[PDB]
């Protein structure tokens, strides 16, 4: 009679369909998903240092909008900007806004150091009812609105050397009055001009008098500029009116900091990968949650699923 | 005696050479080409909506050059700009020309809506012999050349609210006269200035008096600017001379529209993929016709041929 | 008794570990390295035409700094800029510096042709003690500092047609005096203005009077501009003061030229691939020396080694 000896392999009742080079649908015994397609919905506060902007854009926190005083000198790995954020100070613009936002975001600090600028012969600390703190007239915390002193505004020609080891970031502005009479009222002369320089750079800005649509009841504007001063270089501000003066400098660092627009709530939890939709697990190589990511993240792809076979072809009985 | 039974495979007398991982030349029984290397030479008018610019650049059709009146309010999927196109109006430039061209191309419409601007106290509808229609002096159709009225040009301070659901695109300009006397002749004062603003943006432009080389017998110039006004925002134009005024706004849409530079003839035929050399079939995954494409196109590669084996190794008798 | 016949394969005592799809460490009989990770440390002078900038940036060689006269009319495949380079002329800036540097680098020539500009009614060839040659006061070789003649500076309105087959590159500038009295001293009027135009472009620049920090004992500045003039177009310079005039044009070519920042010494040797660290062999497909390359180079990757098996699995006795 003898014997029979059969060689074989396993199978399962519940196989999974995968793609191959020669067939778009072949059943295997098991597979694993390579695309992360879900988020928790919240941004985990760990292990990156998260700073929720709340009502403040980064730029408003930089300048010192009345609603942003709690942000002074804070650092972040990721600054989270909310869609509801709005300004509540003097109406302003920033030529190149995107670049200033980017460079501050990347620096990852609002560390500010006051300096003693000699603003000889003018009135300091101007305020406005468009920028209140506690119902008092106020202004951006990091800027100094200079006006005439006894109807004189003598030329400013002011120096500030950088004798530090690090670069200094200076934020400053120009005031664009609504009318010729507002110009004379504030600065005691018919126009102004501002030249801000270092040994290696120069910027000059001319105020432009005229009506813009009222924002927080103001038809004038401030335009914001910036200047970086290297170790052993010197900031020189030369102006005859309309200067929104710096009060000091921001530290500028390099590192892994960034900024993200998101309305996701921040949670007490730990996740390396952040998207605007919330944190996502990072076990998988790919993800289809968002092209926008921060941290150790899977790579964004268009597919919502990619199944890797982890078993043989399934050939059921 | 018994029998002989031989297993085998086919071969062909006319095999084709392909590349593999281990050999750059191996003969197989059959192959197919994966690189599209030929075009029809014409651009098929279907199924994309093609607009042939003919003598008009997109920007000339936007502004309303005399040769471009047939383009009013037209839409396109693909605007085709011809190398022979030339201007036949007042000589102009557009700072950022490439961006305005791009944003209009992408919007895919020249839909224009007139608005009733209150140009109080000035002469409207200025014309020039450098911009004729039917031998009459004329001007860009979408712009309004304002000049003095009885040797006065009172300050303009004009508002236009956007109470629509959509964004408005405003095109406007500044006139740069050739001399101080041309300046006084046209505007009744020694210089002008233009500030165009919204709640969230501002642009001011100063005219620059002087000689440029004559183009269509004109040594002055117009410089063209634009402003986008969001729903619930307000356009404000504040000017004292030299304003080339808007007559209304363009609609701005988003969608799949673009622009292509090509001299290929447009034909009555149907092809999904357009290149500057003409339409190409899109059965193949790759193509070497042109890096510039529009529609459902094969991907541009440097190779002029890539043969995919569709049969076994050919081993002839 | 019969015989035994065994089939087998070789092995070696000194195998090498490679990576595969299924195993990160498998020993094979032999392998070859696909990542170039070392350089010679020097840049080979062959076969690309190398121009060592020595003390001169490309822009200083363009303008004609006193230390750069040996560079006149030189050509290069690769201009090598040294970190020690410094300027020794009048302090200047170039708005868009990076673009002018790039376009000259890519052109690959400093070929200069003098032209006879009619600077009627002014003093030519101004010099300064901040820009000495051989202890004499001097100036940039390719620029012409115009000042008043007998306390008059009549308006300049000067033309230069391009009747060549090629494009002309014009370099010119604006002088920004330190004070109102320096302005009057040099130009005999209270301000200047410069409009440089062609049939298809225009640039106007306003001088900005004021103090900048002293560089080589100078608190004023020059700002450098450029203009390209096509065949059959015409350069027109219209100015009333502060013009740093062109002396002629640079040829502008297209080809394979570039610029590299490196402190590597130049050697007498032959290598197709240049990096800032020195030339590297180009037998391998990949390299991890530097992302910055010029010539026929392996592709930059992050890995420092990638071993390709060139033999079977090693199975020692
Ligand atoms: C189908 O194929 C997949 C992929 O092979 C397979 O999934 C794998 O299953 C194993 C076993 O369950 C998982 O191993 C676990 O991994 C987690 C980390 O995420 C560990 O926490 C687990 O630890 C347990 O066991 C340890 C033993 O030392 C203990 O230390 C500890 O107490 C834990 O209880 C464990 O190592 C592995 O993560 C997955 N892999 C993937 C990619 O999902 C799945 O099992 C297969 N299914 C079938 C039906 O065969
Ligand atoms: C070498 O290999 C290639 C690739 O396999 C092979 O080319 C293929 O040939 C087949 C058969 O001729 C083609 O099939 C045709 O495809 C077109 C679409 O482009 C259809 O219009 C054709 O329809 C005909 O037959 C249909 C049957 O139902 C009818 O509906 C109709 O009336 C038509 O007459 C047909 O399906 C196929 O497109 C190509 N593929 C490629 C990539 O070219 C070629 O035949 C092989 N050569 C040899 C000598 O073996
Ligand atoms: C392990 O695998 C590698 C890769 O296969 C293998 O390296 C190769 O070795 C051969 C033989 O030494 C090399 O061939 C030489 O290539 C150089 C060019 O760089 C030539 O100059 C050499 O020419 C000599 O021989 C010629 C014969 O006609 C003569 O013309 C001349 O006089 C020269 O003496 C020769 O062709 C080849 O370059 C390498 N390849 C790589 C990628 O390194 C290595 O030998 C293997 N090791 C073992 C132990 O098996
Ligand atoms: C130039 O044009 C602008 C824009 O039209 C004019 O601005 C407008 O000025 C009026 C008068 O001051 C403003 O009215 C105010 O509205 C607020 C809000 O309801 C109200 O609280 C005040 O009591 C007053 O009614 C109006 O807001 C403002 N509009 C805009 C869009 O800014 C300006 O007056 C013109 N200038 C001249 C000199 O004509
Ligand atoms: C750059 O800084 C300098 C240094 O302060 C400024 O120059 C100075 O400007 C003042 C006032 O504008 C000048 O004084 C005036 O002199 C005239 C002429 O006699 C007189 O009519 C006025 O009543 C007043 O006294 C001063 O002369 C001048 N100093 C120098 C050394 O030139 C300059 O204004 C600053 N630039 C900017 C853009 O602010
Ligand atoms: C400033 O310089 C410019 C450039 O050289 C001068 O422009 C030139 O002006 C002359 C005189 O008007 C123009 O001549 C005209 O040429 C046309 C074309 O053939 C002809 O039809 C007219 O009858 C006349 O001859 C010339 O075209 C023009 N050149 C350029 C390049 O624009 C300008 O005159 C100078 N201004 C002053 C005040 O000197
Ligand atoms: C921005 O829009 C306003 C509103 O029209 C313009 O301000 C107004 O400008 C006019 C004419 O330039 C001023 O009138 C002049 O007053 C002087 C001083 O008495 C007189 O010498 C002139 O004969 C003329 O009457 C008017 O006062 C002024 N209005 C206000 C409220 O300040 C302004 O010009 C516009 N800006 C631009 C850049 O166009
Ligand atoms: C406006 O402010 C600037 C910046 O503080 C002043 O520039 C400074 O001017 C002084 C006086 O000329 C310069 O002093 C010189 O220093 C050199 C170098 O040691 C020395 O050789 C000279 O004998 C003299 O002492 C100083 O270098 C310069 N500083 C900078 C940073 O540029 C300018 O004087 C002010 N203008 C007015 C009108 O007040
Ligand atoms: C653009 O080039 C033209 C052509 O030279 C310049 O225009 C000319 O400028 C001069 C001097 O600025 C003017 O002369 C002056 O006339 C007045 C009025 O009588 C007088 O007070 C002065 O003493 C002097 O004679 C000349 O009239 C004028 N020519 C023309 C045809 O308008 C212009 O200045 C140049 N632009 C720039 C930005 O340099
Ligand atoms: C994560 O958020 C993104 C961004 O909002 C979502 O992507 C959008 O999805 C909507 C459909 O509801 C599309 O209309 C948009 O085109 C997408 N936005 C952009 C900017 O491309 C996405 O659905 C979210 N993913 C998960 C897993 O929650
Ligand atoms: C399609 O048009 C392109 C663009 O003109 C052609 O590519 C050019 O080919 C010429 C040779 O005649 C080269 O000198 C140029 O370098 C190419 N132009 C550019 C801009 O790179 C191409 O030959 C055409 N292809 C087909 C199939 O007609
Ligand atoms: C070639 O030069 C580059 C550039 O300096 C070297 O890369 C740097 O390596 C240092 C470590 O000493 C790092 O701190 C820097 O991040 C690298 N620089 C940049 C700009 O990324 C590299 O080591 C050199 N390679 C060889 C083979 O000599
Ligand atoms: C098949 O069933 C087993 C046991 O319930 C399970 O662990 C495995 O993941 C299933 N296969 C699927 C879901 O494809
Ligand atoms: C943000 O602003 C809203 C009003 O716009 C206010 O209700 C809320 O309390 C503010 N939040 C903070 C943190 O200041
Ligand atoms: C301006 O305000 C600061 C506090 O913000 C104060 O220290 C300083 O003395 C004030 N200076 C003047 C001149 O008012
Ligand atoms: C070989 O000949 C057949 C019959 O003529 C043809 O259909 C096939 O495409 C040919 N092979 C080529 C052109 O490589
Ligand atoms: C375009 O311009 C040329 C003359 O430059 C003319 O012959 C042709 O008819 C014009 N075409 C159209 C459509 O206006
Ligand atoms: C300007 O021209 C338009 C037609 O283009 C006309 O409706 C309008 O009445 C004219 N206005 C003036 C003031 O000439
Ligand atoms: C093994 O030894 C031989 C002979 O010395 C040598 O040629 C070969 O490259 C060696 N293998 C290595 C270094 O992996
Ligand atoms: C470059 O400058 C240094 C001084 O800074 C000098 O020693 C050297 O000789 C100069 N080299 C050349 C080639 O001019
Ligand atoms: C200016 O200098 C050049 C030599 O650099 C000389 O040929 C020319 O004659 C000089 N012109 C004047 C007006 O000084």
Residue numbers in the entry:
A (entry chain A), B (entry chain A), C (entry chain A): 9 to 325
List sentences quoted exactly from the publication behind this structure:
The HA RBS engages host receptor sialylated glycans and consequently is relatively conserved in sequence compared to the rest of HA1.
D190E imposed a significant fitness cost in Bris07, Perth09, Vic11, Mich14, and NDako16, but not in Shang93, Mos99, and Wy03. In the panel of the eight strains tested, Bris07 was the earliest strain that lost the E190D reversibility and Wy03 was the latest strain that retained the E190D reversibility. The Cα190-OH98 distances in HK68 WT (Glu190), HK68 E190D, Wy03 WT (Asp190), and Wy03 D190E are around 9.0–9.7 Å, whereas this distance in Fin04, HK05, Vic11, and Mich14 is around 8.5–8.8 Å. Relative to the WT HAs, the mutants bound more weakly or not at all to the array, but when binding was observed, specificity for human-type (α2–6) receptors was strongly maintained.
